[PDB]
Design a binder for this molecule. Structure first.
Ligand SMILES: COc1cc([C@@H](O)[C@H](COc2ccc(C3(C(=O)O)CC3)cc2)OC2Cc3ccccc3C2)cc(OC)c1C
Ligand SMILES: CCCCCC/C=C\CCCCCC(=O)OC[C@@H](O)CO
Length: 382
């Protein structure tokens, strides 16, 4: 059993897994649809990689990482192509080395996109707290990051092919993968799922902080209109106190522009002192100067955050579609070794195609969300 010259039939018969010898009707259609999707992945992801390369506006650290994510899908397109060519009756034709090759290329392609989306999540976590994009130094650093992403992918796709397999542990073989160990699949599934959880936490921290700044901006704009209305001294004090409390929460999270927002805190504090004396008209005039102060930075930060959030939402849709399709397949791996006889793993072909379509979904997402990229795709074709 331990590295014997045994066929794939030896491993597939021992575990509760089917192996075909004849050309089945569904095997021809799953191969037919499989190749058709693979060719589209190798064309749609190649089109967006050329689009970032020729367009001047897409020469930024965030867009270079998107091209690497497309390159990971392009590699996945080649990985699933070799898989569909060796499915059904052609599965029996595979040797011990070639089985680990098709299974290895798929494991490499997943962690290539997993580490890419992880790097994009870190990229967005820095740029939001740094307001705008970085210099040329980060573009040289991105090349180093791309190396780390692909190195991690090659290593993760080699770990089961470098001793961690049930070849010399034939009793601990999984029902889904007859050459892969159950201890590896439990580790592999919990590794990719914990990465999805920490990635959700990263964007939740971004959206939460943006919502905290937007509600503070809402409190600063609504209470400013209350002072504009001719009212008593007590009404002016209540509106200024709410603006001061919102401003202190706004300056709470290196590049720091806190010396710009603290000026407004001082202007409100000086306006609050005028209201305490009894001067209502002077307090209303001082609060009117605060309106011209916020209308000066509305073109420097409030007009640039809309372009940032438009690209941020696009990234979350790419990550969202990735979780929704890959999680049922990874949960299936957990139910394979930790759920024996509770339920049959019949929905195996469905979850495989569900994850395959995601590699084609990414250029489709950038086509209707990004305005500049949509016009660039037509320029390459013509
Ligand atoms: C190491 O973890 C795995 C294991 C597999 C495969 O060995 C099995 C083996 O199951 C297969 C299911 C269908 C066929 C096909 C057939 O019709 O026979 C379409 C070719 C082949 C193998 O797929 C399962 C279904 C799935 C989906 C998404 C994510 C994980 C899994 C586990 C695929 C895979 O990526 C797709 C990962 C990440
Ligand atoms: C350099 C350019 C091209 C050379 C190809 C780079 C991609 C990596 C292919 C190897 C892989 O994924 O490992 C599979 C093993 O598990 C099988 O045993």
């Amino acid at each position: 059993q331990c590295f014997y010259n045994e066929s794939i039939a030896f491993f597939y018969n021992r575990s509760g897994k089917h192996l075909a010898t004849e050309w089945n009707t569904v095997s021809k259609l799953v191969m037919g649809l499989g190749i058709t999707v693979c060719i589209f992945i190798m064309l749609a992801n190649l089109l967006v990689m050329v689009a970032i390369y020729v367009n001047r506006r897409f020469h930024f650290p965030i867009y270079y990482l998107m091209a690497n994510l497309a390159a990971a899908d392009f590699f996945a397109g080649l990985a699933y192509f070799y898989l569909m060519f060796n499915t059904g009756p052609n599965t029996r034709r595979l040797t011990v080395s070639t089985w680990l090759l098709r299974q290895g290329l798929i494991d490499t392609s997943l962690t290539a996109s997993v580490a890419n989306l992880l790097a994009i999540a870190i990229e967005r976590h820095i740029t939001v707290f740094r307001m705008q994009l970085h210099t040329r130094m980060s573009n040289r650093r991105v090349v180093v990051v791309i190396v780390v992403i692909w190195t991690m992918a090659i290593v993760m796709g080699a770990i089961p092919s470098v001793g961690w397999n049930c070849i010399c542990d034939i009793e601990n073989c999984s029902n889904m993968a007859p050459l892969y160990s159950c201890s590896y699949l439990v580790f592999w599934a919990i590794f990719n799922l914990v990465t999805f959880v920490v990635m959700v936490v990263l964007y939740a921290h971004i959206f939460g902080y943006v919502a905290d700044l937007e509600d503070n901006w809402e409190t600063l704009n609504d209470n400013l209109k209350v002072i504009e209305k001719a009212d008593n001294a007590a009404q002016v004090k209540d509106a200024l106190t709410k603006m001061r409390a919102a401003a202190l929460d706004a300056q709470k999270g290196m590049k720091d522009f806190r010396h710009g927002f603290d000026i407004l805190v001082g202007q409100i504090d000086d306006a609050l002192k005028l209201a305490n004396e009894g001067k209502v008209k002077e307090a209303q005039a001082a609060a009117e100067q605060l309106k011209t102060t916020r209308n000066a930075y509305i073109q420097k930060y409030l007009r640039n955050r809309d372009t940032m959030m438009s690209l941020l939402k696009t990234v979350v849709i790419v990550l969202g579609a990735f979780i929704i399709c890959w999680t049922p397949g990874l949960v299936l791996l957990l139910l394979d070794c930790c759920c024996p006889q509770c339920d049959v793993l019949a929905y195996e072909k469905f979850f495989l195609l569900l994850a395959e379509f995601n590699s084609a979904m990414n250029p489709i997402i950038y086509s209707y969300r990004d305005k500049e990229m949509s016009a660039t795709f037509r320029q390459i074709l013509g």
